[PDB]
């Protein structure tokens, strides 16, 4: 019953994911191959969040989610890391459509009842990372 | 907490909604997590079913053709504002939470006999 943000297809048995599943007991290489086979369609290099569901018989199923908004905002602005001092140092610029584009994909993981509400969550996400909206 | 003005604002708004509605269902929502309520909130908006939680004292002030529904308010209370609301509650309550009373035609509907509104087309 663990939640991870492993890479798009770079699901190594490496320490980023390796020891996490070990305490439960699921086969490490089994999950790594299963995750990659369905995330090949995902754009390259994305920390797609997956929630693992392990059982008592040492079996597991997992569900993948849309990429995090902060990741989507980082690629939308063409940057790699956020502002060190958000709302003090400004490190990018994205249009409202770029907010709509990110909101639409994350709408599968949002909770707002409208595109405007979903956007405002993304707008709040943008301010918290120093990315101003332009 | 809530001053008289804020409570007066609540009483008017739920009175306005109760005025422009058609049917009401009173349900229990003690012990159900927010996530399952989040699902109900999406379901209620999709089916155009207004849903709110208010104080029973505030509810009884505003609710006075639902007076027959203003007869069982002791314990946690949830209210929703034709048909398909009791249908939605019965499915969720069976699969999860309970129902207490329903309102229709300005008449009470007992909990066992909400099968009428849950089946009407």
């Amino acid at each position: 019953y663990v939640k991870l943000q492993v890479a798009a297809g770079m699901a190594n048995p490496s320490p980023p994911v390796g020891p996490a599943l070990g305490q439960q007991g699921v086969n490490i290489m089994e999950f790594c191959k299963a995750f990659n086979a369905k995330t090949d369609s995902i754009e390259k290099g994305l920390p797609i969040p997956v929630v693992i569901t392990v059982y008592a018989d040492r079996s597991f199923t997992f569900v993948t989610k849309t990429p995090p908004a902060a990741v989507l905002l980082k690629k939308a602005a063409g940057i790699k890391s956020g502002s060190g001092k958000p709302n003090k140092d400004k490190v990018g610029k994205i249009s409202r459509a770029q907010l709509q584009e990110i909101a639409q994909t994350k709408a599968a993981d949002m909770t707002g009842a409208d595109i405007e509400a979903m956007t405002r969550s993304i707008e709040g996400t943008a301010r918290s990372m120093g990315l101003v909206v332009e | 907490a809530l001053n008289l003005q804020d409570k007066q604002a609540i009483v008017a708004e739920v009175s306005e909604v109760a005025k422009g509605a058609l049917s009401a269902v009173v349900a229990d929502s003690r012990g159900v997590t927010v996530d399952k309520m989040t699902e109900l909130r999406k379901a209620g908006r999709e089916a155009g079913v207004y849903m709110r939680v208010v104080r029973n004292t505030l509810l009884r002030r505003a609710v006075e053709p639902f007076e027959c529904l203003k007869d069982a308010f002791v314990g946690p209370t949830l209210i929703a504002y034709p048909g398909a609301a009791a249908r939605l509650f019965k499915e969720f309550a069976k699969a999860n939470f309970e129902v207490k009373a329903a309102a229709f035609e300005g008449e009470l509907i007992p909990a066992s006999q909400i099968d009428r509104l849950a089946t009407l087309p």
Binding site: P13, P15, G18, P19, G22, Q23, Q24, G25, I28 | -
Partner: protein, 375 residues
């Protein structure tokens, strides 16, 4: 966790001194490997895992050590049984008892082909190599941070090649004597492959890494019997890398730390920038040199002959011209912006790196290591 337990035939201890001694014949006569497992499993089928006296008298070495390491329900144990029949019979006996005393466990047996100790040429060539593959498979399929080598059972000759794996990869090894009662995490002296000895072989492995096969005679002509184990004969007149070879190839491929050096032109230029910029450049080069991730980030325009520029950051008064040889980070020039701009202005037209290395002996060399005793 995962326990890579070596398996030894201490389980059938109860047949000590009885007329047919416990040998591969004895397993054979009683029906076979599976049939003999039940006979062995009977003698200690009752003993517990929490009882101290049974741990030290009535159970195998794998069972005693595993019970001491704290085997639980959520565990996975591997038994590297021997190739001999008497070895495998006990393997099928330990597993039945382990899957009985701790239900919900996953024990699987690997039969290391050719692990017999009655022949030398086979053991030197197929035993340790196969055992080296099997262990290195499980560690790489479960991460170095989760495997615990258990070199207590089995022959005394496998133990060198279990612990040595632990030292190289990083997994620990835990051992416990029969009469003792304390688990001993064996010391892990940091070791690696001798880069100096192995460096001339780099082009040789390069062919194999590309064309995946080389004729044997050409391999022998190209290249000291220790190097032989690095190479496994595929069998059709070619040779490919043995499992040890893949370790060496990766060791000769992993990036390492670097120690900066300064050409005679850099040392003249560093000092005149020290007065205006404190001792900032001294730390930056050392910081970049001893961090491979920092080095790969800062590569500005790359020049010929393996030169590539570095810079502290935006709007800085220094940009370095460095290149790598062995474990040394040679620094050729250290120039400010205007000299840097003109160099790149010149390099637009023709080649640049050729002109620098051409005068290496007259102007830049010798490179002196970056240790300073300013006082």
């Amino acid at each position: 966790a995962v326990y890579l337990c070596t398996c030894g035939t201490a389980a059938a201890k109860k047949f000590f001194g009885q007329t047919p001694r416990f040998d591969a014949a004895w397993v054979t006569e009683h029906g076979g490997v599976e049939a003999a497992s039940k006979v062995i499993y009977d003698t200690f089928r009752t003993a517990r895992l929490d009882d101290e006296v049974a741990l030290k008298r009535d159970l195998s070495a794998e069972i005693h050590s595993l019970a001491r390491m704290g085997v639980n329900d959520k565990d996975t144990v591997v038994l590297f049984s021997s190739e001999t029949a008497d070895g495998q019979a006990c393997a099928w006996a330990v597993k039945r008892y382990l899957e009985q005393a701790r239900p919900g466990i996953l024990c699987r047996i690997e039969v290391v082909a050719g692990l017999q100790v009655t022949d030398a040429h086979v053991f030197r060539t197929a035993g340790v190599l196969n055992f080296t593959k099997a262990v290195l498979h499980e560690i790489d399929a479960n991460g170095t941070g989760q495997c615990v080598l258990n070199p207590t059972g089995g022959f005394k000759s496998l133990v060198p090649y279990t612990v040595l794996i632990g030292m190289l990869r990083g997994v620990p090894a835990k051992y416990i004597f029969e009469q003792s009662s304390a688990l001993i995490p064996l010391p892990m002296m940091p070791v690696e492959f001798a880069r100096s000895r192995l460096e001339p072989l780099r082009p040789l492995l390069e062919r194999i890494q590309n064309e995946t096969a080389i004729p044997r005679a050409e391999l022998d002509k190209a290249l000291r019997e220790i190097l032989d184990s690095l190479f496994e004969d595929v069998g059709q007149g070619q040779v490919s890398l043995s499992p040890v070879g893949f370790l060496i190839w990766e060791e000769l491929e992993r990036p390492t730390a670097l120690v900066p050096f300064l050409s005679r032109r850099a040392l003249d230029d560093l000092l005149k920038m020290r007065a205006t910029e404190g001792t900032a450049p001294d730390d930056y080069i050392t910081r970049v040199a001893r961090s491979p991730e920092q080095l790969a980030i800062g590569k500005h325009e790359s020049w010929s002959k393996g030169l590539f520029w570095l810079k502290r950051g935006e709007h800085t008064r220094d940009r370095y011209l460095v290149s790598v040889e062995g474990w040394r980070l040679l620094v050729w020039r250290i120039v400010d912006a205007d000299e840097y701009d003109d160099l790149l202005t010149q390099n637009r037209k023709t080649d640049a790196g050729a002109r620098v290395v051409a005068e290496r002996r007259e102007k830049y060399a010798p490179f002196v290591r970056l240790e300073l005793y300013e006082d």
